[PDB]
């Protein structure tokens, strides 16, 4: 039951960390309508994190969403490197959202047919939200890439900046393989076709170039992160670390 715990935790960690990033945007968006959308997506993602983290705690037989979020350190977090990247400008944020949304849609479509009932049920809620996310993020990819000269250039720089982290989306380890062989999990390697089909298309439709660099960065899943995660956790966990074991 250990591998199942780790697998559920990872999905929760992706959603949790991305949620944190989107939270920093609150009141700082280019339009009110965007502020609203970013808050909404962040809220959806937080909801999925709570569902995945709660299930992970249940599986482990101890803790809850809060002990998992607030008492683990960076070497124990298992989110994808992509979701811990800084917000940068709006293009940076849209690029990251897009890559994650495409992946989420591909993953949850398949994961709702999981032989694990609770994972299937969570994925069934998640997919509905992920589709709205992909519409938003693909929408802006189009608007920015196929906008002005300035905006299209920023959108391309954003895609180039994040590109190397996309390899982790299709990296499979012992946990993924064992569980996909049991029909419980999706083998990430098999997500590449659907992902590339959507993303390659979207990038092309936005008059941009798919980068030629072969993506090479992994590690998040095994607790090996960029120097970004640590400072995020310091901010997120502060209050729980100052006053542990309390009710709020």
């Amino acid at each position: 039951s250990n591998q199942l715990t780790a697998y559920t935790l990872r999905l929760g960690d992706n959603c949790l960390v991305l949620s944190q990033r989107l939270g920093e945007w609150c009141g700082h968006a280019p339009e009110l309508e965007i502020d609203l959308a970013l808050a909404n997506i962040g809220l959806d993602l937080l909801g999925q994190a709570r569902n995945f983290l709660s299930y992970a705690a249940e599986l482990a037989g101890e803790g809850d969403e809060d002990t998992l979020a607030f008492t683990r350190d960076e070497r124990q977090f298992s989110n994808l490197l992509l979701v811990e990247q800084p917000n940068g400008n709006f293009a940076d944020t849209i690029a990251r959202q897009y890559f994650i949304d495409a992946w989420h849609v591909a993953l949850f479509t398949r994961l709702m047919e999981s032989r694990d009932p609770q994972l299937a049920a969570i994925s069934a809620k998640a997919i509905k939200e992920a589709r709205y996310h992909l519409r938003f993020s693909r929408g802006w990819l189009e608007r920015l890439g196929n906008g002005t000269d300035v905006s299209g250039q920023k959108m391309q720089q954003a895609i180039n900046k994040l590109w190397r982290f996309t390899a982790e989306l299709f990296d499979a380890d012992e946990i993924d393989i064992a569980l996909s062989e049991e029909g419980i999990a999706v083998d990430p390697r098999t997500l590449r076709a659907a992902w590339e089909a959507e993303v390659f298309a979207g990038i092309n439709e936005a008059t941009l170039n798919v980068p030629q660099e072969q993506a090479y960065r992994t590690g998040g899943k095994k607790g090996l992160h960029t120097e970004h995660l640590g400072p995020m956790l310091a901010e997120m966990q502060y209050l729980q670390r100052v006053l542990p074991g309390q009710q709020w």
């Binding site: 939270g23 920015l144 002005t148 920023k154």
Partner: protein, 296 residues
């Protein structure tokens, strides 16, 4: 003239003035200012609350805080819609907000220095807004009143969550209790000032239905018991029940402070407008992009 008579009649018989209807220009203008400032308030208020999203103590509370901030953006949008039915443009009054030519609720010029501040804003500050908004539900201008009804149904829910977050602190560790008391100490008087100073045309026109003092009185009458439920004190030595009137009498509001705050010389005035300005300026390339893409 005769229009300014059927109008006076519609106000008396409590019939809703709609956008297409005739109305005096002065009434049109004071409504643009009020609905406009109300809309600005929803937008600026996102900042002090948003300051704690990434730091909120539990995923439950974090989720509640995001939901509330999302709603504020939504309510900002309803109120801008409602303002535009009077002929003004939203980017125009928005710019006046950025210039200082239009104002927003004074309460959002105070900093959130602890997690309790969020609970207290949710409970006290929103408590004050709800009183003010329920009171504006029978305002004479139809699109404004209908908006007030829609907003009140949703906002009171969030205000209850605010109070529950405060109850968690009040029933918690000693440090949590002190955190709460401190937040109350810093937010009590600024909350009382939200209602405004101690109107001729507005009351006659039924834009405003109650005086500032009346509304403040009822806020205090309803809030003091809640403060007691939490085992907390109010930072007012002169707060006492008066069995003659049947109201709580309370100390003088420091109006010098209120005047500094609304004139841009409060604690966070500069930081709030700087944040909105920077958001607007740095967002220009994004808005232009959306425009250009639509034209294709």
């Amino acid at each position: 003239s005769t229009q300014e008579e059927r109008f006076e009649q519609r106000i008396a018989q409590e019939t809703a003035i709609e956008p297409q209807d005739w109305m005096p220009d002065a009434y049109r203008k004071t409504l643009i200012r009020q609905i406009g400032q109300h809309a600005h308030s929803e937008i600026v208020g996102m900042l002090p609350e948003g300051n704690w999203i990434t730091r909120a103590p539990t995923l439950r509370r974090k989720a509640i805080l995001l939901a509330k901030v999302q709603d504020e953006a939504g309510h900002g949008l309803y109120l801008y819609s409602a303002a535009e039915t009077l002929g003004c443009a939203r980017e125009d009054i928005y710019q006046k907000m950025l210039d200082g030519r239009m104002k927003y609720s004074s309460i959002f010029n105070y900093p959130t220095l602890s997690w309790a501040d969020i609970g207290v804003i949710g409970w006290l500050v929103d408590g004050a807004a709800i009183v003010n908004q329920v009171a504006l539900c029978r305002t004479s201008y139809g699109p404004y009143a209908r908006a007030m009804v829609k907003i009140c149904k949703e906002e009171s829910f969030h205000q209850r969550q605010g109070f529950e977050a405060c109850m968690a602190l009040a029933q918690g560790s000693e440090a949590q209790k002190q955190m709460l008391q401190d937040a109350i100490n810093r937010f009590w008087w600024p909350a009382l000032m939200m209602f405004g100073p101690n109107s001729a045309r507005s009351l006659t026109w039924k834009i405003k239905r109650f005086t500032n003092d009346e509304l403040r009185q009822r806020f205090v009458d309803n809030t003091v018991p809640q403060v007691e439920m939490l085992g907390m004190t109010v930072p007012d030595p002169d707060l006492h029940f008066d069995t003659e009137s049947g109201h709580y009498r309370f100390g003088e509001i420091d109006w010098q402070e209120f005047n500094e705050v609304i004139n841009g010389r409060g604690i966070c005035n500069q930081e709030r407008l700087d944040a909105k300005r920077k958001a607007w300026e740095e967002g220009t390339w994004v808005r232009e992009a959306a425009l250009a893409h639509a034209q294709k």
